[PDB]
Ligand binder design. Structure first.
Ligand SMILES: C[S@](=O)c1ccc(-c2nc(-c3ccc(F)cc3)c(-c3ccncc3)[nH]2)cc1
Ligand SMILES: CCCCCCCCO[C@@H]1O[C@H](CO)[C@@H](O)[C@H](O)[C@H]1O
Ligand SMILES: CCCCCCCCO[C@@H]1O[C@H](CO)[C@@H](O)[C@H](O)[C@H]1O
Length: 337
């Protein structure tokens, strides 16, 4: 049984949606497509509905539409954006051209909730605990976020937090190896970001507000020191090793004299997150077991994902192949409990 759809002009196109979604009100448009807030009469929930723009305009658009859908369908965790619904007005493949995605309405990001204020230690424990819990899940699926920052973090007024992959509402939270276009990366690029987020929550200041790419690097090296010999050993590029070999060696500052007054557990966790050598950074699961999170840690409700086959989305296919693939993802969607 199909729901009854209704047609309505919004953000300069005809939106066509099930009647369960009421009171459509645009929150944003862009090249990606646009979004309305709505009330979902069926669940009683305030929801965001995204209408993809030009989803099947080209191979690249089609490919991306398929990845976005597939990723959304696989993310099922309290601290990660998930899918409430996916729908198309289309009744067959032959007429399939629009894709709408539904999730909880999110009216505020982490910036919007903290507003450059120091938070209490307890409040930072809660926020960070959740980021890390979502990241354990995400990383267990063999995914690296790669651009974790306060704008990619949805936080309601109960400080309940979800990781996003789009700015809801800088380069300051990026791992130094991402800033340096390092060919390889591990999941601890995201742990670096968490450390930057956590420092700023504690202190009320951006940790490394560089004015540009190199000023950013200088600020980082100042806190965490220049590469040691173990780290230099693992540099492939002759130009990167010759650059480093020519730096005046600086020592890693004492984080106790940077985070004056902070809980000593908080300083300890930060020392473990903000190691230059990414092989040396704490992992999410490890950070979740750290004493800093004693009050929130439950080793039995820190769930993992089935690894996520990213090969199916990096194929080189034809428009109408990606579109039928995407159409099957729509048809197969099972609403969550
Ligand atoms: C690339 S651009 O900066 C961009 C901006 C916003 C969004 C954007 N996408 C969504 C959104 C909506 C429904 C979904 F199912 C998935 C994502 C939202 C959203 C979700 C919940 N409440 C408010 C807004 N914002 C996507 C891309
Ligand atoms: C759905 C929210 C879960 C977070 C998973 C985010 C996965 C993001 O994955 C990232 O996407 C970028 C392009 O936007 C790529 O350039 C990066 O290489 C990639 O790591
Ligand atoms: C001058 C500033 C240099 C920044 C040093 C970045 C060190 C990051 O750490 C490196 O991460 C790589 C993945 O990117 C791994 O392959 C390396 O083994 C690891 O040491």
């Amino acid at each position: 049984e199909r729901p009854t759809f209704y047609r309505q002009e919004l953000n300069k196109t005809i939106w066509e949606v099930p009647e369960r979604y009421q009171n459509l009100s645009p929150v944003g448009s862009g090249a990606y497509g646009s979004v309305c807030a709505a009330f979902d009469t069926k669940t009683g929930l305030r929801v965001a509905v995204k209408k993809l723009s030009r989803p099947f305009q080209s191979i690249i658009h089609a490919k991306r539409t398929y990845r976005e859908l597939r990723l959304l369908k696989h993310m099922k965790h309290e601290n990660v954006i998930g899918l409430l619904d996916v729908f198309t007005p289309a009744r067959s493949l032959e007429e399939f051209n629009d894709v709408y995605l539904v999730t909880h309405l999110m009216g505020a990001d982490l910036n919007n909730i903290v507003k450059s204020q120091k938070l209490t230690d307890d409040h930072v424990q809660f926020l960070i605990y959740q980021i890390l819990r979502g990241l354990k899940y995400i990383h267990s699926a063999d995914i690296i976020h790669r651009d974790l920052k306060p704008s990619n973090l949805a936080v309601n007024e109960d400080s309940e937090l979800k990781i996003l992959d789009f700015g809801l509402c800088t380069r300051w939270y990026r791992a130094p190896e991402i800033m340096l276009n390092w060919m390889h990366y591990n999941q601890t690029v995201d742990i670096w970001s968490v450390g930057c987020i956590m420092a700023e929550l504690l202190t009320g200041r951006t940790l490394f507000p560089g004015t540009d790419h190199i000023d950013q690097l200088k600020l980082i090296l100042r806190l965490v020191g220049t590469p040691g010999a173990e780290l230099l050993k693992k540099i492939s590029s002759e130009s990167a090793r010759n650059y480093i070999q020519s730096l005046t060696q600086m020592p890693k500052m004492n984080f106790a004299n940077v985070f004056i007054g902070a809980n000593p557990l908080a300083v300890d966790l930060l020392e473990k997150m903000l190691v230059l050598d990414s092989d040396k950074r704490i992992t999410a699961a490890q950070a979740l077991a750290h004493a800093y999170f004693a009050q929130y840690h439950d080793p039995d409700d820190e769930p993992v994902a089935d690894p996520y086959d990213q090969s199916l989305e990096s194929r080189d296919l034809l428009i109408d192949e990606w579109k039928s693939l995407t159409y099957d993802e729509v048809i197969s969607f099972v609403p969550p409990p």
